[PDB]
Design an enzyme around this catalytic site. Structure first.
Site, PDB file in Angstrom:
ATOM      1  N   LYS A  84       1.553   7.240  -8.917  1.00  0.00           N
ATOM      2  CA  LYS A  84       0.230   7.853  -8.876  1.00  0.00           C
ATOM      3  C   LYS A  84       0.190   8.958  -9.923  1.00  0.00           C
ATOM      4  CE  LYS A  84      -3.122   9.682  -5.472  1.00  0.00           C
ATOM      5  NZ  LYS A  84      -3.265  10.101  -4.040  1.00  0.00           N
ATOM      6  N   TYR A 128      -8.216  10.262  -5.339  1.00  0.00           N
ATOM      7  CA  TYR A 128      -7.551  11.356  -6.052  1.00  0.00           C
ATOM      8  C   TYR A 128      -6.902  10.944  -7.373  1.00  0.00           C
ATOM      9  CZ  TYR A 128      -8.244  15.361  -2.992  1.00  0.00           C
ATOM     10  OH  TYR A 128      -8.802  16.410  -2.298  1.00  0.00           O
ATOM     11  N   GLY A 129      -6.514   9.685  -7.547  1.00  0.00           N
ATOM     12  CA  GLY A 129      -5.870   9.353  -8.800  1.00  0.00           C
ATOM     13  C   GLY A 129      -5.920   7.888  -9.177  1.00  0.00           C
ATOM     14  N   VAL A 130      -5.085   7.542 -10.156  1.00  0.00           N
ATOM     15  CA  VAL A 130      -4.854   6.166 -10.568  1.00  0.00           C
ATOM     16  C   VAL A 130      -3.377   5.856 -10.369  1.00  0.00           C
ATOM     17  CG1 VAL A 130      -6.705   6.356 -12.257  1.00  0.00           C
ATOM     18  CG2 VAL A 130      -4.317   6.612 -12.988  1.00  0.00           C
ATOM     19  N   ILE A 139      -2.620  -0.548 -11.349  1.00  0.00           N
ATOM     20  CA  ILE A 139      -2.575  -1.403 -10.168  1.00  0.00           C
ATOM     21  C   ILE A 139      -3.429  -0.839  -9.036  1.00  0.00           C
ATOM     22  CG2 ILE A 139      -0.316  -2.416 -10.693  1.00  0.00           C
ATOM     23  CD1 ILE A 139       0.897  -0.439  -8.739  1.00  0.00           C
ATOM     24  N   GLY A 140      -4.270   0.153  -9.321  1.00  0.00           N
ATOM     25  CA  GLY A 140      -5.135   0.639  -8.260  1.00  0.00           C
ATOM     26  C   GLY A 140      -5.680   2.048  -8.375  1.00  0.00           C
ATOM     27  N   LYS A 141      -6.942   2.222  -7.983  1.00  0.00           N
ATOM     28  CA  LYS A 141      -7.592   3.527  -7.888  1.00  0.00           C
ATOM     29  C   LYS A 141      -7.918   3.774  -6.420  1.00  0.00           C
ATOM     30  CE  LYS A 141      -8.852   1.465 -11.186  1.00  0.00           C
ATOM     31  NZ  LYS A 141      -9.789   0.442 -11.724  1.00  0.00           N
ATOM     32  N   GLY A 142      -7.098   4.584  -5.758  1.00  0.00           N
ATOM     33  CA  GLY A 142      -7.426   5.020  -4.416  1.00  0.00           C
ATOM     34  C   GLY A 142      -8.309   6.251  -4.453  1.00  0.00           C
ATOM     35  N   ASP A 167      -8.662   7.755   5.981  1.00  0.00           N
ATOM     36  CA  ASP A 167      -9.187   6.803   5.007  1.00  0.00           C
ATOM     37  C   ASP A 167      -8.629   5.407   5.262  1.00  0.00           C
ATOM     38  OD1 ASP A 167     -10.830   5.927   2.953  1.00  0.00           O
ATOM     39  OD2 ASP A 167      -9.683   6.930   1.371  1.00  0.00           O
TER      40      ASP A 167
HETATM   41  C1  LIG Z   1       2.732   2.476  -3.011  1.00  0.00           C
HETATM   42  C2  LIG Z   1       1.394   2.078  -3.529  1.00  0.00           C
HETATM   43  N1  LIG Z   1       1.222   0.834  -4.157  1.00  0.00           N
HETATM   44  C3  LIG Z   1      -0.115   0.686  -4.548  1.00  0.00           C
HETATM   45  C4  LIG Z   1      -0.663  -0.511  -5.224  1.00  0.00           C
HETATM   46  C5  LIG Z   1      -0.125  -1.752  -5.337  1.00  0.00           C
HETATM   47  C6  LIG Z   1       1.258  -2.047  -5.045  1.00  0.00           C
HETATM   48  O1  LIG Z   1       2.154  -1.257  -4.651  1.00  0.00           O
HETATM   49  N2  LIG Z   1       1.569  -3.421  -5.250  1.00  0.00           N
HETATM   50  C7  LIG Z   1       0.355  -4.035  -5.686  1.00  0.00           C
HETATM   51  C8  LIG Z   1       0.127  -5.374  -6.019  1.00  0.00           C
HETATM   52  C9  LIG Z   1      -1.177  -5.717  -6.419  1.00  0.00           C
HETATM   53  C10 LIG Z   1      -2.187  -4.780  -6.488  1.00  0.00           C
HETATM   54  C11 LIG Z   1      -1.936  -3.443  -6.143  1.00  0.00           C
HETATM   55  C12 LIG Z   1      -0.677  -3.058  -5.743  1.00  0.00           C
HETATM   56  C13 LIG Z   1      -0.784   1.863  -4.142  1.00  0.00           C
HETATM   57  C14 LIG Z   1      -2.224   2.101  -4.363  1.00  0.00           C
HETATM   58  C15 LIG Z   1       0.166   2.758  -3.516  1.00  0.00           C
HETATM   59  C16 LIG Z   1      -0.030   4.117  -2.866  1.00  0.00           C
HETATM   60  C17 LIG Z   1      -0.750   5.242  -3.621  1.00  0.00           C
HETATM   61  C18 LIG Z   1      -1.164   6.478  -2.733  1.00  0.00           C
HETATM   62  O2  LIG Z   1      -0.649   6.519  -1.584  1.00  0.00           O
HETATM   63  O3  LIG Z   1      -1.973   7.324  -3.180  1.00  0.00           O
END
Ligand SMILES: Cc1[nH]c(/C=C2\C(=O)Nc3ccccc32)c(C)c1CCC(=O)O
Ligand SMILES: [Cl-]
EC number: 2.7.11.17
Length: 260
Positions: A35, A17-19, A12-15, A124
């Site tokens: 993460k 430092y990780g996936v 659900i996402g690549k910020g 960021d």
């Molecule tokens: C708590 C959280 N959710 C996400 C991603 C999503 C989420 O939650 N619903 C979603 C619904 C659709 C797409 C991405 C997400 C991230 C990247 C992080 C934090 C990760 C971080 O801080 O490194």
């Protein structure tokens, strides 16, 4: 794939430092955001964890627990799921309306003010790190390169973050010292510009030219969409290249565009 009580699901996402994978906790029938990190450097990860542990605000993502087995190459940070995901994608042909931008920008103000009060520089801020929660409000995510300071402000010399959002005073070719809060303000200004125009104000595929435009190209607003003059004033003030005259968060809170 299981990891104690958690079942790992799709990404659900690549910020930074990780996936991040969606994860199901079988003990409470609740989804989380996990993460996943591969040890490849690790001091910064435990400083992010230490920062996250101190934070508790409606506009900041909530770290729930950390899974660290010394016999495992992988380290897991479990966050509370933010079900609706990033506020927008950049670039886009369909930016937010001014009224939508203001709604989210108000949450961004409250979260940044809280972070700075907690002596954290985020470093960021950008739309993809602004997650829309169950109730429609923003939660600031991804503290992977954040800084904690003592005293009134951070005094920094390292260049980190997302290039298109980096403040020009962090781009000197001489390791000069610059202050921290104004960096987040600059990134907030790039973010607000993104909200209503759907692209960054300074763009170049050539990183040298991108740095040069951030540092030396005067801000230009597109003809379309036609935005209000007070919003142009606010964006201009946040994208002041001089960090000493750049608007500060206690002023942003009061800006006529913000309060109407
Ligand atoms: C708590 C959280 N959710 C996400 C991603 C999503 C989420 O939650 N619903 C979603 C619904 C659709 C797409 C991405 C997400 C991230 C990247 C992080 C934090 C990760 C971080 O801080 O490194
Ligand atoms: Cl983004």
């Amino acid at each position: 794939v299981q990891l104690n009580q958690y079942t790992l699901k799709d990404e659900i996402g690549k910020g930074s430092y990780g996936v991040v994978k969606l994860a199901y906790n079988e003990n409470d029938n609740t989804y989380y955001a996990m993460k996943v990190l591969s040890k490849k450097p690790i001091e910064q990860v435990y400083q992010e964890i230490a920062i996250l542990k101190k934070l508790d605000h409606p506009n900041v993502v909530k770290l729930v627990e950390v899974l660290d087995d010394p016999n495992e190459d992988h380290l897991y940070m479990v966050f509370e799921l933010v079900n609706q995901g990033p506020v927008m994608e950049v670039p886009t042909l369909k930016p937010l309306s001014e009224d939508q931008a203001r709604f989210y920008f108000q949450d961004l103000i409250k979260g940044i003010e809280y972070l700075h009060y907690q002596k954290i520089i985020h470093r960021d801020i950008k739309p993809s790190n602004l997650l829309v929660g169950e109730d429609g409000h923003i939660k600031i995510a991804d503290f992977g390169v954040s800084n904690e300071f003592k005293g009134s402000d951070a005094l920094l010399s390292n260049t980190v973050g997302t290039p298109a959002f980096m403040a020009p005073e962090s781009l000197s070719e001489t390791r000069k010292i610059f202050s921290g809060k104004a960096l987040d303000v600059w990134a907030m200004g790039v973010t607000l510009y993104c909200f209503v125009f759907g692209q960054c104000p300074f763009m170049d595929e050539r990183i040298m030219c991108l740095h040069s435009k951030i540092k030396s190209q005067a801000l230009e607003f597109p003809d379309q969409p036609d935005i209000a003059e007070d919003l142009k004033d606010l964006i201009t003030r946040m994208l002041d290249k001089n960090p000493e005259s750049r608007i500060v968060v206690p002023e942003i809170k009061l800006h006529p565009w913000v309060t109407r």
